[PDB]
């Protein structure tokens, strides 16, 4: 069977924390789970390369997509096929928010590139950890464009996105994610 | 302004040889020339990425395209804007032949990705050094693959017969260079 879930938001919005808490909840229920992330879940070398260089947004998107293409084929789809709940800390929506809304790349192009890269794989639910940039643990204008881009995406796909106030305490956010997830188990 | 030229063909077809000859030939005529290549002209580290074992053909193309996007923006468009003859040893047609005909990726997707990557930039002429596939001898680059790529290049040449100049790669180096030069004479000046 398999269940594909993602977490999205600005750096320091609590994604890795909530990813780790969601995996733990699922383990306590006896459900096999796989935790993964972008960038680097497909091509670790893309992550390291982008850490130290800044490229055109078009080149950056394409590297993020090459990583994503390997990630879907070698990690995510095999995980789903084995019946795992696969949780990715960032997925396509990260490219849409950062390279699209942030850097100005056209979204329909981004999605056409993604179409083969992802084999059209979409998560069943996406938890958006929403907060202002100055509440996170370029320039500020960029991060505002990203944050608002995420909320734009969420608004267009209310079936898939769950928007959470990421400034709330950690345990409270975790329980909110759990409540949304329950109807899709066991 | 400026003139955009490319060379294409299989591994081992002589395109580096002819690209370098042409660059020197044009520079001897007092013409400003920028000699470049793919992969690596945009993002030199992509050659490392491309070597990754068991790469999906989709990721493989996406890596070529990342390099190409950076290459066009940072090297080719500024060279052409300064009035240079820019010569690229491989460009987008390499992807169409290798990733499209070779690996089997759908051509329209390849082109849609390319459209932003290249910003629509096409060479004025492309010199295809047509080499028999057995003479060519990434992963899976055996005979069946090279046959597909070789024929792929020939189909691309037929689809765009004004852009592509197809040359017999087995001819002596000086004969091919002379043929390339003759095709260029009407554009230069
Ligand atoms: N017309 C010709 N006849 C015979 N040999 C030739 C030739 N032109 C080039 N060569 C030789 O063939 C070999 C490969 O040539 P070259 O490296 O220029 O091809 P290419 O650039 O298409 C290789 P690749 O795609 O692997 O980078 C070299 O040893 C070169 O000296
Ligand atoms: C996955 C992904 C991440 N990013 C950015 C967001 C983060 O700032 C950075 C990843 O950071 P990390 O490797 O330090 O987690 O990459 C994009 O811009 N586009 C994408 O598609
Ligand atoms: C530019 C380009 C090269 N190639 C291939 C040709 C060679 O086999 C290899 C380039 O290797 P090289 O960097 O050692 O010349 O990449 C493609 O498959 N697609 C492309 O778009
Ligand atoms: Cl985070
Ligand atoms: Cl998606
Ligand atoms: Cl909330
Ligand atoms: Cl031109
Ligand atoms: Cl033509
Ligand atoms: Mg951020
Ligand atoms: Mg959680
Ligand atoms: Mg990525
Ligand atoms: Mg993508
Ligand atoms: Mg997502
Ligand atoms: Mg949306
Ligand atoms: Mg060469
Ligand atoms: Mg390239
Ligand atoms: Mg391309
Ligand atoms: Mg070309
Ligand atoms: Mg053609």
From Swiss-Prot, chain A:
Record keyword Nucleotidyltransferase present: no
One GO cellular component term: cytosol
Cross-referenced CDD domains: TMPK
Keyword Transferase among record annotations: yes
UniProt GO MF annotations: ATP binding; dTMP kinase activity
Top-rank EC class of the record's enzyme: transferase
BP term (GO), one: dTDP biosynthetic process
Entry-linked InterPro entries: P-loop_NTPase (IPR027417), Thymidylate_kin-like_dom (IPR039430), Thymidylate_kin_CS (IPR018095), Thymidylate_kinase (IPR018094)
UniProt binding sites for ATP: 9-16
Keywords: ATP-binding, Kinase, Nucleotide biosynthesis, Nucleotide-binding, Transferase
Matches recorded under Gene3D superfamilies: P-loop containing nucleotide triphosphate hydrolases (3.40.50.300)
A Pfam cross-reference name: Thymidylate_kin
EC number of the protein: 2.7.4.9
Catalyzed reactions: dTMP + ATP = dTDP + ADP
NCBIfam families according to UniProt: DTMP_kinase (TIGR00041)
Family to which this protein belongs: Belongs to the thymidylate kinase family.
Free-text function comment from the UniProt entry: Phosphorylation of dTMP to form dTDP in both de novo and salvage pathways of dTTP synthesis.
UniProt name for this protein: Thymidylate kinase
Species: Thermus thermophilus (strain ATCC 27634 / DSM 579 / HB8)
């Amino acid at each position: 069977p398999g269940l594909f879930l993602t977490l999205e938001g600005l750096d320091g919005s609590g994604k890795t924390t909530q990813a780790r808490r969601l995996a733990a909840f699922l383990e306590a229920q006896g459900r096999p789970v796989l935790l993964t992330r972008e960038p680097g879940g497909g091509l670790p070398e893309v992550r390291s390369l982008l850490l130290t260089q800044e490229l055109s947004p078009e080149a950056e998107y394409l590297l993020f997509s090459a990583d994503r293409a390997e990630h879907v084929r070698k990690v995510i789809l095999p995980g789903l096929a084995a019946g795992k709940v696969v949780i990715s800390d960032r997925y396509l929506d990260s490219s849409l928010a950062y390279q699209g809304y942030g850097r100005g790349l056209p979204l329909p192009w981004l999605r056409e590139v993604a179409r083969e890269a992802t084999r059209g794989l979409k998560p069943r639910l996406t938890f958006l950890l929403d907060l202002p940039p100055e509440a996170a643990l370029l320039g500020l204008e960029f991060f505002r464009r990203v944050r608002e881009g995420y909320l734009a995406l969420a608004r267009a796909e209310p079936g898939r996105f769950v928007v959470l106030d990421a400034t709330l305490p950690e345990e409270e956010i975790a329980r909110a994610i759990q409540a949304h997830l329950r109807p899709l188990l066991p």
